[PDB]
Design an enzyme around this catalytic site. Structure first.
Site, mmCIF file in Angstrom:
data_model
loop_
_atom_site.group_PDB
_atom_site.id
_atom_site.type_symbol
_atom_site.label_atom_id
_atom_site.label_comp_id
_atom_site.label_asym_id
_atom_site.label_seq_id
_atom_site.Cartn_x
_atom_site.Cartn_y
_atom_site.Cartn_z
ATOM 1 N N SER A 1 0.750 -1.254 0.000
ATOM 2 C CA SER A 1 0.000 0.000 0.000
ATOM 3 C C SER A 1 0.786 1.315 0.000
ATOM 4 O O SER A 1 0.179 2.371 -0.019
ATOM 5 C CB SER A 1 -0.985 0.016 1.155
ATOM 6 O OG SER A 1 -1.835 -1.112 1.088
ATOM 7 N N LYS B 1 3.863 6.663 4.624
ATOM 8 C CA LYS B 1 2.853 5.787 4.035
ATOM 9 C C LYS B 1 3.416 4.364 4.132
ATOM 10 O O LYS B 1 4.458 4.053 3.574
ATOM 11 C CB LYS B 1 2.474 6.237 2.627
ATOM 12 C CG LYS B 1 1.754 5.217 1.765
ATOM 13 C CD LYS B 1 0.643 4.461 2.460
ATOM 14 C CE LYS B 1 -0.567 5.305 2.737
ATOM 15 N NZ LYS B 1 -1.773 4.454 2.580
ATOM 16 N N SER B 2 2.786 3.561 4.989
ATOM 17 C CA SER B 2 3.204 2.197 5.278
ATOM 18 C C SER B 2 2.467 1.123 4.502
ATOM 19 O O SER B 2 1.715 1.414 3.600
ATOM 20 C CB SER B 2 2.995 1.939 6.767
ATOM 21 O OG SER B 2 1.615 2.032 7.096
ATOM 22 N N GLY B 3 2.706 -0.132 4.858
ATOM 23 C CA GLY B 3 2.033 -1.219 4.194
ATOM 24 C C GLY B 3 2.484 -2.580 4.680
ATOM 25 O O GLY B 3 3.457 -2.739 5.426
#
Lengths: 256, 256
Positions: free
Chosen positions: A39, A201-203
């Site tokens: 993501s 912004k991680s995932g």
């Protein structure tokens, strides 16, 4: 500290790429390895849309419909059969990793097809967008679908945003989102000195693929430090460990 | 339509089990066929914790630490180092598919081990809990980890919520978290008439495993209809089609 030891210690794999926007110093461990970005892709997808759509036009509307609904869409779920502006659509993507907002943003761009060539034009022949959310998360260490190396994806975040072709208003919109996203407080944010700021912004994907990309901002520094940390395990259902990201963040930030 | 014709129309596998808790009438279709349950199981775990905590004690707090944080936790991602009540936990998972929550709840019970003894105590030796949230989403047509079958899952929900040992408050509390969530709008809710109140919980896994369990309320009936629809495709990366769920709920419902 040492990133190598972090891998023995956590029995994972580490993909790092830190590029100082000021000095131009690049710290990197496994930056040429392919990993599932997950993501985190939503930074790329929405930075691209901001390239075309002016900020004075983010008040525009798109009609969200039934076929536009996908699992895990905290906000867009309340808009089935309704309208929503691009601004709000892009906030959901970034603030909540809303999948309905990302896929709609991709379609407006022209499809995965477009996102893909833009990368090429950007001079990125590594990142490989093949699927939409949520499917882009089914990672296989055998395939290349939806993968990228830390130095490749790392430069793209740079070339699109830092030294981007974005406006100054859009750029600051994006960065605000990425700055207030409470989803990464146990990753990079948890490892950078108290004073530094992180637009992240991680995932996470299959094979315990836990990642986090962010634009770090040291003390008295104006130019961030692009920091792409991609990690993963040997097994499909392994549980990742954010500590590894938090710790990898501080081993590398020592160099800056 | 026919359940055998919708599988053709959408090239999927439909598994159905509707139980009219009043007359006892059943409608089955591939009821004994293992399908990944995904997040529909978040309805089991919360129900179980509500059998040992009287409503008057859901305000009991528990601390949420960095350690507890996992991907897709829209709500609980903001409680890193904050306390949170049992009531709040349930809402989070029940309404937002928050995983940090579903796992907190599993922890409060005594682990998958307790959860498991209970399913055996209910007379459920089919439902196969193995992994946690998120990893339990990685379905494999080969594995049987985290799978159940239409009938087994349906009946377990029946013995638990529908006329099971939860208290009046606790049963209204859980059914309200299911009636009021905006995520099964395109699924079973779409198909049955607005006269039909629908309290549900969805989920989505690999091989386009789009599922949706609910307690549907026919206009002029206080007795619910346990509707369990689990579906999926042949390829790991296919896209799901909620239409398949809607249509199925529409036909299966004709028989009640």
């Amino acid at each position: 500290k040492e990133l190598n030891d972090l891998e023995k210690k956590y029995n994972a794999h580490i993909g790092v790429y830190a590029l100082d926007t000021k000095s131009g110093k690049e710290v990197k461990f496994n930056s040429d390895k392919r990993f599932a970005y997950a993501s985190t892709s939503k930074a790329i997808n929405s930075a691209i849309l901001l390239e075309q759509v002016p900020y004075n036009k983010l008040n525009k509307k798109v009609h969200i419909n039934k076929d536009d609904i996908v699992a895990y869409s905290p906000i867009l779920e309340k808009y089935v059969g309704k309208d929503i502006t691009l601004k709000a659509l892009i906030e959901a993507s970034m603030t909540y990793s809303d999948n309905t907002a990302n896929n709609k943003i991709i379609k407006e761009i022209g499809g995965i097809k477009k996102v893909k060539q833009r990368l090429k034009e950007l001079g990125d022949k590594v990142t490989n967008p093949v699927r939409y959310e949520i499917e882009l998360n089914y990672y296989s260490p055998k395939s290349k679908k939806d993968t990228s190396t830390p130095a490749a994806f790392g430069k793209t975040l740079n070339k699109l945003i830092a030294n981007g072709k974005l406006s100054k208003e859009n750029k600051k919109f994006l960065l605000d989102l990425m700055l207030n996203n409470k989803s990464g407080d146990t990753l990079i944010k948890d490892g950078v000195p108290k004073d530094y700021k992180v637009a992240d912004k991680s995932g996470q994907s299959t094979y315990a693929s836990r990642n986090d990309v962010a634009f770090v901002y040291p003390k008295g520094q104006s130019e961030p430090i692009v920091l792409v940390i991609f990690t993963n395990k040997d097994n499909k259902s392994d549980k990742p460990n954010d500590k590894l990201i938090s710790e990898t963040a501080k081993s590398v930030m020592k160099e800056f």
